[PDB]
Amino acid sequence: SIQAEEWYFGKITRRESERLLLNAENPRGTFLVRESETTKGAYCLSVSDFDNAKGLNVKHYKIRKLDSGGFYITSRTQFNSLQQLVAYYSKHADGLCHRLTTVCPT
Numbered sequence: 001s002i003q004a005e006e007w008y009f010g011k012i013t014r015r016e017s018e019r020l021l022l023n024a025e026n027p028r029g030t031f032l033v034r035e036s037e038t039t040k041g042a043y044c045l046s047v048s049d050f051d052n053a054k055g056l057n058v059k060h061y062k063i064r065k066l067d068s069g070g071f072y073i074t075s076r077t078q079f080n081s082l083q084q085l086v087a088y089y090s091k092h093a094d095g096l097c098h099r100l101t102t103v104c105p106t
């Protein structure tokens, strides 16, 4: 049950995810998973980042889910569940702006 996950914010917009993530108290990797605004069957991983050039900022990554079962941001790296995907990216930055750290406070 992905709806049961505390990091799943459901039906919130890209702008709302940015409002939540752009809080100065959020360290790099603060994140949430929400519905994609324009891709049916897809989710979006929103993550906070911070650097001396941009300061506090937010990146969004589309998560695809196959009818064949797999979940992925890049098709070369798939998972059997969204929970497994989140756990993997909490340990590996790979192409993300930062590894996933803490769930975005509301």
Ligand SMILES: O=C(O)[C@@H](c1ccccc1)S(=O)(=O)O
Pocket (backbone or CB within 6 Å): 013, 014, 035, 036, 037, 038, 039, 042, 043, 044, 060, 061, 062
């Ligand atoms: O449509 C989407 O899933 C989202 C998205 C994610 C990354 C890039 C473009 C669009 S959005 O919900 O932020 O627009």
